[PDB]
Symmetry: C2
Subunit: 437 residues, 2 copies
Amino acid sequence: QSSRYVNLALKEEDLIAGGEHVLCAYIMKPKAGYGYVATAAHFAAESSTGTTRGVDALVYEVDEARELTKIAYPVALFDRNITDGKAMIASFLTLTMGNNQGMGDVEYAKMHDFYVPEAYRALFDGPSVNISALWKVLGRPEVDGGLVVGTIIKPKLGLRPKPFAEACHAFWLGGDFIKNDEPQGNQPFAPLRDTIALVADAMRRAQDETGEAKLFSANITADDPFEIIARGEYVLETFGENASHVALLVDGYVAGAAAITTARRRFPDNFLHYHRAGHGAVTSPQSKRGYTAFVHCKMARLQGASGIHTGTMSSDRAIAYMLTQDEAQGPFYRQSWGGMKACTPIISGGMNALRMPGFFENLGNANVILTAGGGAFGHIDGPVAGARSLRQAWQAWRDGVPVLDYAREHKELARAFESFPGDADQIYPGWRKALGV
Amino acid sequence: QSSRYVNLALKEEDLIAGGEHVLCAYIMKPKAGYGYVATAAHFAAESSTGTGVDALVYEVDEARELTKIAYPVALFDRNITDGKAMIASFLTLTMGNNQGMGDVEYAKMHDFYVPEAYRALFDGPSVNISALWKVLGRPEVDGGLVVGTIIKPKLGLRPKPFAEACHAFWLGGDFIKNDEPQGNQPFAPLRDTIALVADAMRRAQDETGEAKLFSANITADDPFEIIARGEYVLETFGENASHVALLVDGYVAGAAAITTARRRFPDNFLHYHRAGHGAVTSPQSKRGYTAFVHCKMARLQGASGIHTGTMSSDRAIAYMLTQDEAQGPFYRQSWGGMKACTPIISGGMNALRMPGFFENLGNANVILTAGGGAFGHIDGPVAGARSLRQAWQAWRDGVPVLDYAREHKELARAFESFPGDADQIYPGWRKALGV
C-alpha cells in the first residue's frame, strides 16, 4: 500500500515517453469514510500484485475532488499468446477492470480512458479490412469513398425465409447494405441455411435489375467458435461470387471477445461487424461501474473490428476520430496507432436527406455506414426513393453542389424537400421557390 | 404495442405446464411518466419481434416493479451443427439491445425459467466436484470439502519461486489455482511455469502420499490459443493430467471462451472464475442481472465450478447450482439430471467458522479457496490448511470441535490464531482447550 502503489511525483509525460506503461483513468469513489489516496493504492494493488520491479501498478495522479485516479500498469503485467506472440483484450480487462470492479472499499469505479504504448499496441490484431473493403466492392474510391446506406430488417424476428428474402430484395433497389437484426440466427421457423440461400438469391436479382453491387451483413454469433466458423463458411460459400459482399456480424458484447477474435482470424478478408447488442449498466447513463462507450469502442479497433455500431444522438464524434484517425485525442490521453487500420463507425439513426449534409459537415466526412430506421427512409414515394435521396444528399455534399440546385436535377432528393417540408424552410428556405411548389 | 404484447390472463402454472415458453422476471421502472404496462409491452416488443413467437408480458405489479414475460422457445436460436442451444441468444434476446431503451430506466433480470424442451438443448456441466473427489481418492457422493488457495502474490514470482510456493502449500492443502491474470507474462512464461509446477505436484504428492490438484488459467481471446494452453498444460502434467482443473475467466473473455473449454476438454473440471461481473452483477446495479442469474446460467453453459461467494443470492444460489430441483426468487427450476455446478467459496474462512457454514449450507460439498483461513494461522499457512481439513472432519464425524481440537494441534491453534472468532464462536475454549 500507500508508499508502494502511489508515486504522485511522476510526470504523465515521462510515462508516455517511457513507453513501458499502459495508463488508465477512472472515476472511482472510496466507500464512506476511507482515505482517498489509501483506497487508490488498494485499487491499484488489487489490479496489480496483491501479496516492485515495475510489476507494481503505480498511482501517478489523483484528484480527490473530481474523484480522478490515474494508474500506470507496466506492459509486462499483460498476458500474451503462447502461440502467436500476440497480446489479448481478455488480459487487459482482467487486470484493468477485472474483480477490482468487485471491491468492498470502493463505492463505484469506472474507467474513462486508457493509453497503449507502441511495444504493447503493436502486439494486438487491429482491423484487417474496413469500409474500404465495402467501397472497393461498391466500386468507390478506396480512400474517402463515402456513405453506405443501410437498414435492419424490421420485424427483428418472425419473418419466414421468403418473406425475409423478399424484404431484402425490395430494400436493395434503393439502399446499399442490409444487416440481420440482433437475434436473427437459426430459429426453427426460419432456418439459417434456408434463409441464407434465399437471401443469397435476392442479392443476384437486386444486383441485376439495378446494376449496382449490394451488401449484406449476416450474424454468425454463437457460443461455440466452431459454430461461429460453421456459419461464416456456409454463408460465404452460398453467396459464392458475392462472397466479398458479405459482412460477418458478431455480437461481441454478449458473446465475449473469443467470439470476436474467432471471426477476425478465421475470416480476415471480410468485414467484421461488431453489434453493440446491449452495454447498458456498464457503458451507460453513467453506470458508475465498468467503462464507457468511448473505451468499449477504442478497445474494438485493437481487437480487430472493421466497423462497430457507434452513435446517433465528449461525444460519439470523438469516438469516431479515435477509431478512424492515426492520431486521436481521447478525454485524458492522446493516442497514436502507428499505421493501424481504422475501424468504421456505423451510425444508427435516420437523419433524412435535408439533415444528412449537416451530419457530414460537423463530422468532416461521410466515411460511415448508416443503418437508418425505416423512418430515415420515409418519403411520399417510399423507402426506395427515401434511400435514394440519402444517397443523393451525399453526392451533392461530396461534390460541393448546393443541395437545392442538385435537388432540381434529382428527383427523389427533390421529392424529399416536400416529404419533410417542415425541415426544409428551417434548414433551406425557398426550396419550393427553387421548385417543389 | 400494449394489447398485442400483454395478456395478463395467462396463468404462470399453465405456461410452466406446456413447457414451451422461457419465462424471465424483472425489476424495471419506466422513465419520467410512462405507463407501467405500456413500457413493458414495449420491452416485450424490443426483445421478441416488434414488427409464442411474440413475447408476452403475463404478470405485472407496478407497485413492486415487476414484469414477468413469456418468450416462446421458437425465438431461441440453435446450432446448425449440433442442433443445440446457445447462451448468447438467451442473453441477446432477454438482456441485449432491449437493455438500452428510453422510456426504460432500469430493468434487471432477477430469475428465469427454462422449459424442459429448451433446458435440454444446453451443454450443462460435464464434470463437477466428483472428479476432484475421485482424484483425491474420496467418495463421489458426499466426498466433502476440498482445501485450496490462490497462490500469492498475484503476479511477480518467477517460474521457480512460483513452483516452490505451490509445493509448500500442497503439503497441507489440496487445491491451488492461478490468479485473475497469471499466464504467459515475460517475467514468468507459461511453458516454464507449467513445466515446473508439474514437478512440484509430483514432489509434494510423493512426500505427502496424497493426490493434489492444480487449476491452470487458459483464458485467452483466440479459442485456438485457449485450446493451445489447455493442451500444453495437460500434456505437461502427464500422468497427473486428471488433477488439473482448467480455469477460464468466463465473464471477461465471454461465452465462447467458456464453451471452448467445456467442449474441447470435457473430461476436466472447467473452473469458471467470474473476475469482473461486479459491474453488471453489482448488488448496487439496477441493470443487467443478479449473481443468481449469472451462476444459474453457468450450470447450463457447463462450468464445473463457479466462484459463488462466502457469506437469496448464495443460500438460494448454492441449492440452485447443485440440486436437481431448486427454488429461485420467482421460479422453481427442475434440472432433469443435468450435472451440478459446485460452489467455490472464497474469502477469509478460518477453521472456527467452517462448522456453522456447513451446518447452514447442509453439506461440505464445495471447494474453498482460502487466504486468511490459511495464511492467517499463527503457525503458518500449511498449518492453516490443515486446520480447515481438521474442522471439516470434526463436523463430518459428529465430533464437537473443542473435542476434535484436543487430539489435533492445528485445530487447537486456530482458536489461538483467531481469538475473536474463538471468543465469539467457541465460549470456554481457553478453558476447555486448556492453556
